[PDB]
Amino acid sequence: HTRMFSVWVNGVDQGDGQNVYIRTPPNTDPIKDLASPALACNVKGGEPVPQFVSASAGDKLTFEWYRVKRGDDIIDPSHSGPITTWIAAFTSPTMDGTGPVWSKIHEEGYDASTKSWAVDKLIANKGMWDFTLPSQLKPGKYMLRQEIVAHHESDATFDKNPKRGAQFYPSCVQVDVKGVGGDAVPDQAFDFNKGYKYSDPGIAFDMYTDFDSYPIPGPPVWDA
Numbered sequence: 696h697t698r699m700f701s702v703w704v705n706g707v708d709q710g711d712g713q714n715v716y717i718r719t720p721p722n723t724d725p726i727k728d729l730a731s732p733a734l735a736c737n738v739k740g741g742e743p744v745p746q747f748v749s750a751s752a753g754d755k756l757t758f759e760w761y762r763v764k765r766g767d768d769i770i771d772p773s774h775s776g777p778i779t780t781w782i783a784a785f786t787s788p789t790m791d792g793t794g795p796v797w798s799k800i801h802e803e804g805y806d807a808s809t810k811s812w813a814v815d816k817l818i819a820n821k822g823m824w825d826f827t828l829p830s831q832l833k834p835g836k837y838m839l840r841q842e843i844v845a846h847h848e849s850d851a852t853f854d855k856n857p858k859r860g861a862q863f864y865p866s867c868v869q870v871d872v873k874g875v876g877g878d879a880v881p882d883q884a885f886d887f888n889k890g891y892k893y894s895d896p897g898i899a900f901d902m903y904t905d906f907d908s909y910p911i912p913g914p915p916v917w918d919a
């Protein structure tokens with residue numbers, strides 16, 4: 696359980712953008728059903744909020760996460776797993792992120808040199824999570840997903856046992872990109888509902904074992 700408080704652009708807090716430029720869900724509840732339409736942008740994913748975060752191709756974006764109160768434990772430390780970041784064109788305001796529209800622009804999972812997960816890193820850095828807007832990205836409005844997966848119950852799956860299974864905590868943010876940018880258009884055209892499966896060994900994952908590495912779900916990060 697956790698969700699996003701606000702977004703920063705090159706070290707600059709844009710200010711609490713919950714229901715302003717973040718499609719904030721009612722609560723910190725997870726997604727578990729792979730079939731669910733909220734897998735993409737969570738349970739108010741399809742409801743537009745009015746403001747966009749104003750950034751540029753190449754800007755360094757920091758998403759701030761919190762559990763109950765801004766600047767608390769961010770997420771129960773049992774919730775160990777990766778942290779992926781995606782991008783899809785803002786096709787129109789009532790898009791809910793479903794369909795074959797997404798491209799992977801960032802990830803972390805399990806670094807075995809340090810035996811630390813992405814979630815370990817996020818707690819340590821106070822719920823701040825950095826990534827970059829590809830330099831060659833084309834101008835105009837996108838949607839930036841970013842999703843924590845907690846694997847403390849992935850030692851079974853939602854379809855076989857529903858009291859457990861992977862837990863998704865996606866947050867979708869509206870972005871208007873300025874500046875010169877480039878030609879590059881995200882064209883990996885990924886679909887959470889089609890593309891995340893219960894047979895995926897990075898979704899049915901026994902984190903309670905002698906394991907050396909973690910297969911991050913979805914495609915590679917996208918080039919240009």
Ligand SMILES: OC[C@H]1O[C@@H](O[C@H]2[C@H](O)[C@@H](O)[C@H](O[C@H]3[C@H](O)[C@@H](O)[C@H](O[C@H]4[C@H](O)[C@@H](O)[C@H](O)O[C@@H]4CO)O[C@@H]3CO)O[C@@H]2CO)[C@H](O)[C@@H](O)[C@@H]1O
Pocket residue numbers: 696762770771773774847848850903
């Ligand atoms: O399964 C084999 C493995 O189990 C290990 O223990 C696990 C449990 O399996 C797992 O169910 C448990 O999950 C907890 C979770 O850690 C808590 O953080 C969470 O709390 C939620 C709560 O649901 C909400 O009401 C509240 O608002 O939010 C908090 C989070 O912020 O509750 C779930 C269970 O409901 O995690 C255990 C790990 O500590 C054993 O340790 C291991 O030996 C076994 O091999």
Ligand SMILES: [Cu+2]
Pocket residue numbers: 696697725771774
């Ligand atoms: Cu939780």
